[PDB]
């Protein structure tokens, strides 16, 4: 089924010092690809060394504690960052049915 | 500071005393005294743990000209006075160049001064050290080369018989057990052999 995710919440002030603390646990699943393929891994190139860039999609239950501009850690050790408001967060325009699912474009850096 | 102001104003600010609130005045002399100073201009150069010391020895110097100083808001006040070296009478020299430092000993032969280092011998032939803590319990070695310069601080000594007597880099000879031991001294190319006798 689903796997628990550690969420870190923090707002940067004018001093530019982030203060991220534990906001709880959120249940969600990851999707490394929009369709039948997978997203390519970015290359830092300019950065001195070696790294990778990834943009995945996160599926979470409606009305979850997760919010944009937060940090997400998986059960293996990798830490991801989610940015941007959730998409498809509305009901059916014709009738009003609620799917209860939203997509988060989380950026995978580790 | 004190010496800089004394040199730049040609006075002796010894009788002056700071006020109760720190107020001080630097007074220019009514008649400009030609006070002479002792100047030492020493440089520094480092080669491993043995550096090179060079200095410009001069026993008489005085002010020659003070350049215009700029105290605007782009740099600190600059005091750059030129000094003309004079000739001293009680020592007979005016300007002297001197080289010192342990590192200079390595390249003194290469510089052509004196003679090249080709021979070496430990001055104590057969030193005797008492096993007990007596007057002659400890002895100091001193290897002398063909150039008449000591080579103790740089040349390391190895004791082939540590049971009888052990010699460290400092050249100490204390002796562990009574007997005869052989000490070899090398720096990078030259090997010298010495015999040390230990007895109670």
């Amino acid at each position: 089924n689903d796997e628990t995710l550690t969420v870190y919440r923090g707002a940067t002030d004018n001093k530019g010092n982030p203060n991220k603390q534990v906001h709880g646990t959120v249940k969600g699943v990851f999707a490394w690809g929009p369709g039948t393929s997978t997203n390519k891994f970015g290359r830092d190139r300019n950065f001195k060394g070696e790294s990778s860039s990834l943009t995945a999609e996160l599926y979470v239950k409606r009305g979850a504690d997760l919010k944009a501009r937060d940090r997400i850690r998986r059960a293996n050790g990798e830490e991801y960052s989610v940015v941007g408001h959730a998409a498809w967060d509305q009901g059916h325009p014709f009738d009003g049915f609620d799917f209860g699912y939203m997509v988060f474009q989380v950026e995978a850096v580790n | 500071q004190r010496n800089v102001l004394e040199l730049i104003w040609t006075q002796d600010f010894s009788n002056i005393q700071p006020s109760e609130f720190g107020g001080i005045v630097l007074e220019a002399p009514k008649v400009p005294k030609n006070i002479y100073y002792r100047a030492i201009l020493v440089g520094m150069d480092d080669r491993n743990d043995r550096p090179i010391w060079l200095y410009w020895l001069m026993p008489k110097v005085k002010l020659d000209k003070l350049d215009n100083q700029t105290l605007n808001d782009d740099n600190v006040i600059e005091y750059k006075p030129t000094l003309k070296a004079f000739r001293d009478d009680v020592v007979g020299y005016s300007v002297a160049q001197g080289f010192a430092g342990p590192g200079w000993r390595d390249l003194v032969a290469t510089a052509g001064f004196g003679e090249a280092l080709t021979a070496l011998t430990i001055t104590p032939g057969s030193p005797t050290v008492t096993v007990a803590t007596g007057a002659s319990h400890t002895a100091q070695l001193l290897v002398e080369g063909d150039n008449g310069i000591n080579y103790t601080p740089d040349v390391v000594f190895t004791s082939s018989a540590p049971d009888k007597a052990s010699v460290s880099a400092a050249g100490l000879v204390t002796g562990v057990a009574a007997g005869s031991a052989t000490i070899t001294a090398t720096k990078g190319a030259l090997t010298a052999t010495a015999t040390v006798t230990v007895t109670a």
Binding site: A11, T12, D13, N14, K15, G16 | D73, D74, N75, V76
Partner: protein, 164 residues
């Protein structure tokens, strides 16, 4: 915070000086060196903010106890006239600064020597942000140093203790 005790500080962090003094001058309008999420939440109506970002340019001499940097001034607000008047106020508060003191909450009071000018105001075109009006200018600010004593000694004894 595990820095050695024998070292306290080296520089003044002149941008912290400037942001703190501007916040103290007019607490109603916030100023800083970052982009808080609360400010980014609303964009049609924005609280006027003064931003200082360090830019390269200017040498430094430890012997002369003089430091300088090409710190730039960037103002963002919802009106061009408001941005221009804020930039004029900042320029009036920065250019005629010749030997002026101001104290930080840390305890030391900094000394601003001279704040120059390199490039004039820049009415940047609205890109990611459309409604907000942004004006950018660069200042050549020179500040004094807090403590200029050398730390040769402690490094030397640490080296001697570690190796010898």
């Amino acid at each position: 915070v595990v820095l050695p005790d024998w070292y306290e500080e080296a520089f003044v962090n002149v941008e912290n000086l400037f942001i703190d003094m501007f916040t103290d001058l007019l607490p109603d309008y916030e100023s800083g060196c970052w982009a808080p999420d609360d400010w980014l939440a609303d964009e049609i109506e924005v609280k006027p903010t003064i931003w200082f970002f360090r830019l390269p340019g200017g040498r430094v001499d430890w012997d002369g106890r003089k430091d300088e940097c090409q710190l730039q001034v960037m103002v963002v607000t919802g009106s061009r006239d408001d941005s221009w008047r804020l930039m004029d106020f900042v320029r009036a508060m920065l250019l005629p600064m010749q030997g002026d003191k101001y104290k930080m909450a840390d305890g030391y009071t900094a000394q601003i020597r001279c704040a120059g000018e390199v490039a004039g105001p820049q009415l940047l075109t609205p890109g990611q942000r459309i409604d907000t009006r942004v004006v950018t200018a660069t200042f050549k600010v020179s500040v004094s140093m807090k403590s200029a004593k050398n730390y040769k000694q402690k490094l030397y004894e640490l080296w001697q203790a570690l190796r010898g």
